[PDB]
Design a binder for this molecule. Sequence first.
Ligand code: Q5H
Ligand code: Q5H
Lengths: 412, 412
Amino acid sequence: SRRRVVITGMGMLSPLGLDVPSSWEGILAGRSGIAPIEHMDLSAYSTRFGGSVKGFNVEEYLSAKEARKLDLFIQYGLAASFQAVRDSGLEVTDANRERIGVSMGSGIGGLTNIENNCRSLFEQGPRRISPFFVPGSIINMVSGFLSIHLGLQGPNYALTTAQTTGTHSIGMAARNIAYGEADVMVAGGSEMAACGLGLGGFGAARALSTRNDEPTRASRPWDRDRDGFVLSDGSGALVLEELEHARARGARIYAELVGFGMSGDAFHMTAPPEDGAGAARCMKNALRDAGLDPRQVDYINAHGTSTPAGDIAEIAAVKSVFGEHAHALSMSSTKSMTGHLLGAAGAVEAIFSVLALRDQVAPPTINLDNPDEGCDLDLVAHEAKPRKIDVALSNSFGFGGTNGTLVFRRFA
Amino acid sequence: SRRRVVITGMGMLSPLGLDVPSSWEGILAGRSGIAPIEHMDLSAYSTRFGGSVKGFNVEEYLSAKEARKLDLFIQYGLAASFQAVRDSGLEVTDANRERIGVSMGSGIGGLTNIENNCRSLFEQGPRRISPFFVPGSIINMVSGFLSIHLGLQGPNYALTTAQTTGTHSIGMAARNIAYGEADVMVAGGSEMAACGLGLGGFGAARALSTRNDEPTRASRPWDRDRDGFVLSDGSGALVLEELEHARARGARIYAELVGFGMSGDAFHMTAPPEDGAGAARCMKNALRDAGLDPRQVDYINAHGTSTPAGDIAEIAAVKSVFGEHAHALSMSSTKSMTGHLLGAAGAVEAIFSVLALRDQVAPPTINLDNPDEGCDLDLVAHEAKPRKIDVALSNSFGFGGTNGTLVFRRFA
Ligand SMILES: CC(=O)Nc1cccc(C(=O)O)c1C
Ligand SMILES: CC(=O)Nc1cccc(C(=O)O)c1C
């Protein structure tokens, strides 16, 4: 048997807002965070738009000196983490610092830093590479820097499971607390891949929407005219906490993390199976982990990335796991509004799933103008839907066929 | 209730050879795998030597067609993984494929591929970025590709905890099996950071030995004339397996994995505390996890990277954890011979720790000509030591202050 895990703090940078409540207001109003990308020449690229974090002020969190040493994805992850810890009200002491850890991950990490240092290396040679290039670029430095700044001496790691990273980071943090390896974890992910190599890389695989003329309409999960995902930047972080620890200090509890599932498709490098059999097993695993019948699920935050093969495979998976109940639950992709934050997608979508529980409302899938063949579930087309939500699922699936499901429940 | 975990398979690429037994014979002969680097021109760099994998033939595992699409670190991880799985004698069936997962990590992952695509982007433009740049370079794709080739549908993820990756990967995979999430895991790491950004980046931070005149003498843990670590390439993979599962199929058991510890220094991004307080917390966590009296520890495979601050800190933590018993155990750094495989360091070192148990021999710390002040333990200077080993401990420390300890014992 196993300790209960609750959510006491949340923090976020997204294309919709510089914090959770601004982002969540965006979500419920159906607002897009997608725009042509600025201060960067995309003439030669097939995709010129994405979800940028707008007006980020790193000096609310770090000195100019510390910020200069760190890739944007690390800055974004620390901002989300500080917000989350602040939101939790947690006081770190000598009594508890050994019981507080971090698992903040990234899918692709320091690409902007790697770009900038590559320029220096090619143009001038290795003597112009920054001394902080290595520590300032590696994916575990959100966990590293946060632990140094707050004096966190608990489990310290980072997951990198491509587009599953955020979901996996929160799940494995939850396991640390459940099995008594920590009382508190800060978990989630951060990503900044809106550079040459990210838009170029995903663009070369023709994975991206090229709807340059209508950026806010590019991300249209399960719509018949979808043409690939929209690349987005940001971060999400949650304070996970053992229930008796939260209660003792009178912490405000948002929701309970009751279920985590994992699976591998063992199918293709960059496409799921057509029936989404891996997604199905992962969702099944998460529900068994929670001791929940598929019947109990009210809301699914879909992976729902606006790809042809991806979107249909997730519908097939949900129909398989849930049967006739798949038509009674509400499923939406918030990527319709935020785009695809890759490694940070599972973190910000775990937060939206928790807020769907707090506010009893399913966020919309915007741009769902003509549902494709088979896309006949309640996909919350166009507008937010107030409704009863006791249990909310959040799916992430990644290159390599790596799948993650979180199950959240209302607490009382 | 927590299940017992054993090692049934091991695989390796190292600077000492292209499998486990060849690598192991080099370790016991006191052989160095460190040489001037031949694959690039480094006349502009302050470090012009490393531990390269010599004569690696990827077409012993994969078609040339697939190999071409994959960064060396992925090639190296799959090679070590395929060896470990072969060595286990495990058969993947529809009955067990959902119970077999993989956690192979990397510190930096596809940096050679990323640099090469960065050259294309800057010299030509984004149109020359390979369509395989993302799935051929990101860290989670050892786990991805291995699951695709072998049909593994169990937990599928990657850690990135810098030079601690391999230790954390094995540790966390063991926890998956211990807590019932899988019956088998392929776990370890792989690294190939010997490109312009890698040697230039660590050089810029002055982390590397610059002993170009005698590359084989550069890696000299606890020697008073050490001047930084030696950058090394390779992969270690282990098959971890629930004890009853292994017994049930008549598996050859190398050793039991009895202990796993984690901790954060919460001190500095790129140096340990002088007293190795974080290392000490980690080893105590692992010894407690294993239910051991610290006096049962016979052999320690040190992190022992040949850095001024790092080597002395590890002595301090061992003296702090074992008191007078520090003078009875044997502690050696195989990095004296292999150099520093970064994310793969913990993976090849876990393997050398299990082989120390199989063969009852402490591997040498070669090049320990003049042990530094306070470095007065049995550091197995120069020559392999035959001795009683029931319990072996392997340490890894990483940028961010992220620590890991594994404890293995002989299985009867
Ligand atoms: C194996 C696979 O490609 N799974 C999957 C399914 C749907 C969307 C996405 C995506 O995040 O773009 C991914 C990665
Ligand atoms: C926080 C820190 O820098 N720890 C540590 C200690 C000793 C060696 C090494 C290494 O791999 O060179 C590291 C990374």
